[PDB]
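Following up on my earlier message about chlorophyll A. Here are the inputs again, as you asked, copied directly from the submission form:
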Amino acid sequence: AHIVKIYDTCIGCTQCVRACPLDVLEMVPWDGCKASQMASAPRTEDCVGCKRCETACPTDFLSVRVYLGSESTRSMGLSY
Amino acid sequence: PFVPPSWAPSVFVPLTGLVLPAIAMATLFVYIEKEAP
Amino acid sequence: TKLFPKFSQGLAQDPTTRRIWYGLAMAHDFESHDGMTEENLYQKIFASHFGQLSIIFLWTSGNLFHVAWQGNFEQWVTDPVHIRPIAHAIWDPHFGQPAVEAFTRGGASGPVNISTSGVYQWWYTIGMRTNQDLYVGSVFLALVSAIFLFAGWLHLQPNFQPSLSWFKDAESRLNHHLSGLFGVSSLAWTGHLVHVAIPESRGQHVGWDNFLSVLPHPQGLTPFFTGNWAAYAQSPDTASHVFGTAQGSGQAILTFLGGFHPQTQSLWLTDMAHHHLAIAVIFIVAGHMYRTNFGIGHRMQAILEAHTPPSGSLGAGHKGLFDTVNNSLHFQLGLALASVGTITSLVAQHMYSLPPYAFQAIDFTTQAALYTHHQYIAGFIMCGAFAHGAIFFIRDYDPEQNKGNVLARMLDHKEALISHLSWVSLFLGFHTLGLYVHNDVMQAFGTPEKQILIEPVFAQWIQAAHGKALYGFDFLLSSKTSAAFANGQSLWLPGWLDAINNNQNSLFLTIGPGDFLVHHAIALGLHTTTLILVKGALDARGSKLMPDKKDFGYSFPCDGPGRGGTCDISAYDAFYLAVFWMLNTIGWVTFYWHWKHLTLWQGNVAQFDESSTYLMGWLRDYLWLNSSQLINGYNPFGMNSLSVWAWTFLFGHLIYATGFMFLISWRGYWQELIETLVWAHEKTPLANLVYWKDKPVALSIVQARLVGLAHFSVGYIFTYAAFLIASTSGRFG
Amino acid sequence: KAGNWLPGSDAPAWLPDDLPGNYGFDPLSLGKEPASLKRFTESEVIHGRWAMLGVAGSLAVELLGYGNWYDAPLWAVNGGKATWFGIEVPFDLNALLAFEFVAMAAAEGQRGDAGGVVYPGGAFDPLGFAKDSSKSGELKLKEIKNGRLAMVAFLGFVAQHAATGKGPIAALGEHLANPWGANFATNGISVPFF
Amino acid sequence: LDPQIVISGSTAAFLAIGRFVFLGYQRREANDDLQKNSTIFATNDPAGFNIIDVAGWGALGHAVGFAVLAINSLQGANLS
Amino acid sequence: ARPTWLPGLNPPAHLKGALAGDNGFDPLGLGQKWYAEAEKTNGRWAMMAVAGILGQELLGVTPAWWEAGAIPAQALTPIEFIVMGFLEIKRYQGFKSMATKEVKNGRLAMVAFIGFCVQALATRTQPIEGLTAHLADPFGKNITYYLTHLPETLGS
Ligand code: CLA
Ligand code: CLA
Ligand code: CLA
Ligand code: CLA
Ligand SMILES: CC1=C(/C=C/C(C)=C/C=C/C(C)=C/C=C/C=C(C)/C=C/C=C(C)/C=C/C2=C(C)CCCC2(C)C)C(C)(C)CCC1
Ligand SMILES: CCCCCCCCCCCCO[C@H]1O[C@H](CO)[C@@H](O[C@H]2O[C@H](CO)[C@@H](O)[C@H](O)[C@H]2O)[C@H](O)[C@H]1O
Ligand code: SF4
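Thanks, got it. Here's what our run produced:
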C-alpha cells in the first residue's frame, strides 16, 4: 500500500478530500488551524497513488504527501 | 589429450542452445510461480 | 503468497507481472533487502566479488581453450602478417552450403570466425608458441576459477565470516594492495618477461621443464648484488632482429631504448621488463605508508584532519571525510568507478599510439576494435561513477557529520557549478555547430576557400615540444640545442625521436583544422554529459521544485502532474538522460579515431584533412562511402563472409528502433490496451480454460525508461560494431 | 615602524608596529592569519640569511677570478676535480652529497625542534652584539633590510644569467661600457616587443 | 664503487640520523584481533629506538645506497 | 619470566606459556590450538624429510634428492592418494619435557629443509656436499660466492 501523511501545515481547506477519487482522506476536528479541522488519511489501503490530493493542496510546501509503496490489486487500480 | 572429439559440436551446441535452456526455463518458471507457505 | 523474491516481502505479495521484473531488477541492491544489516551487507558483497573473479577466469579459460582447440595459433606464429587469427569454429545447422563455403577461411577445415580481440598478438608477445601452451594455461585458469568460487562459499560459513571491523580496516588493505596486489604482481610479471618472454622472442624455448637451468643473463645475479646494474642494459636487440628467432638478437634484459621494434612495430620487450621492475619498486615502497599493528606509518584520518587551509577558504576542509568515505560503500564505488573509468580511456589512448604487442599495428581491424571496445566501456563506467555519487548523497550523506567541510560546501554553490557547466556547453555547442554549418554552406556554394579553418596551434605546439619537427616550432625536444634534448640523447630520445617523426604510425598523428573542430565537439560532449550527471547528483537531495526529494529515494517515477508537472525529476532519470549523451560523445570520439585511421591506412590522409571540416564530408566520405562492402554481404546475386555483419548491421538498426517505442510511448496508453486483451481472453472459449497466475500489467514508468535505454544502447553498439569490423576487415582482409 | 612602502597609505592592522622591517607591505594579505605570519616571519629571516651568504659567495668567486657562480659545479659533470681558492679538494660528487645531507639534516633538524626560534643568540652570538636586546632593534632592521636586498640581488643573478648567460660581474662591466645599449631592454628576451 | 662501503655507509648514515636527529620528530608525529598492536616491540635502547625503526631507517639506507651504485654504474656503459 | 625471542620483550597476552616451546613469538598476532597441532604435523614431516635427504646421500643413493622423482608414477599417485586419505581422515577424527624437545627439533628440521631447497637452487649441491665445501674453504665458499658465480654453477 502507498503511504499518505498529513503535516501540521494543513489549513483545513478540505480540497484534498474533495479531490480524492478513492475516498482515502477525510476531515477531522483540530485546533491547530483557524478552520479548526485537519485532513486525515484513515483508509490508505485504497489509495491508488494518483496524487490528485497533492495537486489540490494550496500550502507551500505541501501538507499532504503520497509515498508510493508496495503494489496490490487495489493500489494498482486493477478491475481484474 | 585435451582435444575434444570431432563430434563434440554436434552434441554441445544443441545441448546448450535447446536442451539446457528448455530445462532452465521450465525450472525457473515453476520456481517463480511457487507459493510460499 | 509467492516465494520469489525471497529478499522483498513487498514484491512477493505483488499480484501482477510486476514482481518478476522487479525481483530481477532489485536482486543486487542488498541495502534494500528485508532484514539487511550492515555486517551482513559487507559479507554478501565479499562473496559476490569471489563470484565475479571466478567468472572472469573461466571466461579467460574459454578463450584459451577454443583458440587452442579450433584456432590456427601455431600457423599464425609462422606468418602473423599474412594469416588471419581464428576465434572459434561455427556449427550452425541453419547454414546453407554457400554459407558453409563462405565462412571456411584461415586454413581451417570448416567454417570459422576471425578473431578481432587481439589475443593472438598478446599471447605471442608473452612467449606462448604452441597449442600445448594454450591448453595448459586454459586448465590452470579453470582451476583458479574453481578456487575463487570455493573461497566465496567458504567465507560465507559460520567460522569464516569476517567481522565488520575487518572490512573497515582501510590502512591495512591499502598497504597490502599497494605493495602486494600491485607491487609484487608487477615484480612477478617482470620475472616472467626476463625468464620466459624475452628468451622466447630470441628463439630460445624456456618452459617449466627447463627454466631452472637457463640463465636469463650470461651473468646471473652477479651484477644485481654488486650494484653493477648497467650490466643488464648492454647488448640490446639490434635493429635487424627477427622476432622469435636468434638472428640479430641481443643479451640485455633491462633497457631504455624508448622506441618501437623495427619489425613488429611495437614496444621493446626489454623496455617493458624495465618498466614493470621500476613500477614494482615504487608500489612496494608506497605500500609501507599507512599504520598497522607495528606502530609506524600514517593514520589516514590524521592526514585528512590536518589539511585545512588556514585562511578558511575551504571552511572546515577535510574534517569528517574519513568517516564519510569509510562508512559509505557508494562513496567508495563512485571513486573506484571514476578512477577505473579514466584508466580505461588511458588504456585506449595509449595502446593504439604505443602498441605493446607484436604485429598489433598492422592488424587494422584489431586496432579499431580494441580502441572502440575500451572507450565505450570507459563511457559506461564514468556514468556509473556519477550515478553512485548521486546515490551516496541520498542514502549515505549526513549533513551534520560533514558540517562546513569541502563536501558540504559543494552543495552550497551547486547553482554556481551547474550554471557554469551550462554556459560552457552552450558556448561549445553554438560555436562548434556554427563553424561546421558555416563550412557546409561554403562547400555547398562551391567556395571552399571561404570556410573558417582554425589551426590547432596549441596542440601542434605540444607535439613540437615532444620532438615532432613538422610544425617548425623547434623548442624542447624539437630543438637540438636544448638541455632536454641533450640530457636524454643517450637514454631514450633516439628511439623516441625516430618513432615520433615517422608519419606511418599512430604516435602523435599530424593534426589540422579538421582535428580542431572535432576536438571541440568532444569537449562539448564531455561537458554536457558532466552537466547532466553533476546536476543529477547535486539536486539528488532536493530542488526548488521538489524540496523533499531525498525522502523519495534515488529512483522513483515522478511526483505527478502537479506543480507544473514533474516527469523525470529523480536523480535516476538524470542518469538515464546522461547515457544518451555518453553514447553520442563516445560515438563522436570513435568516429574520429576510425576515419582518421582509415585514411592513414589507405595512404591518403588528405581525404580526412579536406573532408572533415564540414559535416557532409563525414556523411558522404566516412559513413556512406565505407558502407558499400558491408551492405553487400548478401544480395540477390549471392553472399560472402560479410553477410553476418550485414545481418548484424540491420539487427542493430532494428533493436535501436524498437527502443524508440519504449522511450516515446508511455505507460498509460499500454495499460488501457492490455485491459481489452484481458477481457478478450476471459470471453474466448477453449482459451479461458487456461489462466494466468500473475495479472498482466503494462511495464512501470521507470522500467520503460530502462528497457528503452537498453534497446537504444544495444542497437547503438551492435550497429557500429558491424560497421567498424566490416568496413575495416573488408578493406584490409 | 621602519617606514611606508606606499606613501600616503595605511598599514594593514595585522602587521604589528614593532615587527622588524615593517613597512606595511602586504597587498595580498598573506600574513592576515596570526599563525601564518609567525611562520612567515621566521622564514623571511632564514631566506635572507642564506641569500646574503649566497650573494657574497657568488660575488667573491668571480671577483677573485674563479669563474662565476653558474659554472662552479661543472667539474662534477665534466669529470673534473673540485677546487677551492685554487686548492684541490679530494672529494667527489657522491661523497659531497653524503656529507651535506647528513650535516644539514643534523643542523636543520636541531633548528626545527627549537620551535621557530629566529634569534638564538648564545653560542650563535659569541661577540654579544645583540646580547643587550635593547639596541637589538636597530641591528635586526639592518639584518632584514640587507637580507631582503640580498634576496632581490640573487634573483637578479639568476634572471640576468638566464637572459644573457654572463656572470654578474661580467654583466656589470657590460652595462658600464654601454649603459644605454646594454640593459634588460636590449637583451631581446625580457621585453619581446622591443 | 665498492658495494660494501657504499651500502654500509648509507645504512650507517640513515640509522644515525634516525636515532640522533629525527627520532624526536618522528615520535611526536607518530603520537578484530588482527587490527590491534598486541605485541609491543619493547626495546632496551635508551632513546626508544626499537627493531621496527631499525627496519625503517635501515630500509631507506639500503634503497638510497643502491641508487648511488646504480647511477654510477651507468657511467662508462656501452650501448646504454 | 620465560626466555623471549627478543631481549627485554614482554610476551603477548594471548600466549600464556602453557603450550610447548612458547617463547612469546607472534609479532603478526596470528595466534590470537589448531595451529599448535599444525606446527607439529608440518614439523614431523620436516624431520622425516630432513633425515631422509641426509640419510639417502650418506648411503650413496642417486640421483640427488630433488632429482629422486625423475612402479610407474602415474600408477603410484592413485595409490598414495587413496592410502594417505584413510590415515589422515582417521588422524583428523581422533584430533576432532619431551613435547618441548619435539617442537624444538621439529622447528629446526623445518628451517633445515628450506635450507636444502634454497641451497640446491643456488648451489646445485646436496646438503653434505655443500657442508664439505664450506669446511674446506669457509671464506671462499659461502652464499656470497655462489650468488656471484651462478653462470659457473649452471655452466656444467
Ligand atoms: C638450519 C639452518 C641452516 C644451516 C645450519 C645452514 C648452513 C649452511 N648453509 Mg644454508 N640456508 C638455510 C639454512 C641453513 N643453512 C636457509 C633457511 C636458507 C634459505 C634462506 C639457506 C640458504 C642458503 C644458501 C643460499 C647458501 C647456504 C649455504 C650454507 C653453508 C654456508 C653458510 C652460509 O653461507 O650461509 C649463508 C646463508 C644463510 C641463509 C645462512 C642462515 C643461517 C641462520 C642461522 C638462519 C636463521 C633463520 C631464522 C631463525 C629464520 C627466522 C624467520 C622469521 C620469519 C622469524 C652452510 C653449510 C651456502 C653454501 O655454501 O651452500 C652450499 C649457500 O650458498 N644456505
Ligand atoms: C542453438 C539453437 C538451435 C538449434 C540447435 C536449432 C536447430 C535446428 N533448427 Mg533452429 N531455431 C532456433 C534455434 C536453434 N535451431 C531459434 C532460437 C529459432 C527461433 C528464431 C529457430 C527457428 C527455426 C526454424 C523456423 C526452423 C529451424 C529449424 C532447425 C533445424 C535446421 C536443420 C534442418 O533442416 O532440420 C530439418 C529437421 C530435421 C532433420 C528433424 C530433426 C529432429 C527434430 C527437430 C526433433 C525430433 C525429436 C524426436 C522425434 C523426439 C525427441 C528426441 C530427443 C530426446 C533425442 C534444426 C533442427 C528448421 C526445422 O526443420 O525445424 C524443425 C526450421 O524450419 N529453427
Ligand atoms: C563495480 C561496479 C558496480 C557495482 C558493484 C554496482 C552496484 C549496484 N548498482 Mg551500479 N552502476 C555501475 C556499476 C556498478 N554498480 C555502472 C558502470 C553503471 C553505469 C551503467 C551503474 C549504474 C547504476 C544505476 C543507474 C543504478 C545502479 C544500481 C546499483 C545497485 C543495484 C544493482 C542491481 O540490482 O542491478 C540489477 C541489474 C539488472 C536487473 C540487469 C540490468 C541489465 C542491463 C540493463 C543491460 C542488459 C543488456 C542486455 C541483456 C544485452 C542483450 C544482448 C543481446 C544481443 C542478447 C548496486 C548497489 C541501482 C541502485 O538502486 O543502486 C542503489 C541503480 O539504480 N547502478
Ligand atoms: C541532435 C540532437 C540534439 C541537439 C542539437 C541538442 C542540443 C542541446 N541539448 Mg540535448 N538531447 C538530445 C539531443 C540533442 N540535444 C537527446 C537525444 C537527449 C536525450 C533525451 C538530450 C538530452 C539533453 C539533456 C539532458 C541536456 C541537453 C542539453 C543540450 C544543450 C547542450 C549545449 C549546446 O549545444 O548549446 C548550444 C545549443 C544548440 C547547439 C542547440 C541548437 C541551436 C540552434 C542551432 C539555433 C538555431 C536558431 C536559428 C535562428 C533557427 C531558428 C528557427 C526557428 C525560429 C523556426 C543543447 C540545447 C543540455 C543543456 O540544456 O545544457 C544547457 C542538457 O542539460 N540535451
Ligand atoms: C558526484 C560525487 C562523486 C563522484 C565524482 C566523480 C565521478 C568524479 C570524477 C572525477 C574525474 C573523472 C576527475 C579527473 C581528474 C583528472 C585530473 C585532475 C588529471 C590531472 C592530470 C595531470 C596533473 C597531468 C599532468 C601531466 C601531464 C599533463 C603531462 C606530463 C606528465 C604530467 C603528470 C606532469 C563522489 C563519488 C566523489 C561522491 C560525492 C558526489
Ligand atoms: C636545495 C634546497 C633543499 C631544501 C630541502 C628541505 C627539506 C626539508 C625537509 C623537512 C622534513 C621535516 O623536518 C622538520 O620537521 C619539523 C618542521 O616541519 C621539525 O619539527 C618541528 O616542527 C613542528 C612544526 O613546525 C614544531 O612545532 C615542533 O617543534 C617540531 O615538531 C623537524 O625538527 C624538522 O626536521
Ligand atoms: S494519491 Fe490519489 S487516491 Fe491516494 S489519497 Fe491522494 S488523491 Fe486519494
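One observation from looking it over: The pocket of iron/sulfur cluster (ligand 7) is lined by residues A 4, 19-22, 24-25, 47-53, 66 (CB under 6 Å). Hope that helps, and feel free to reply on this thread.
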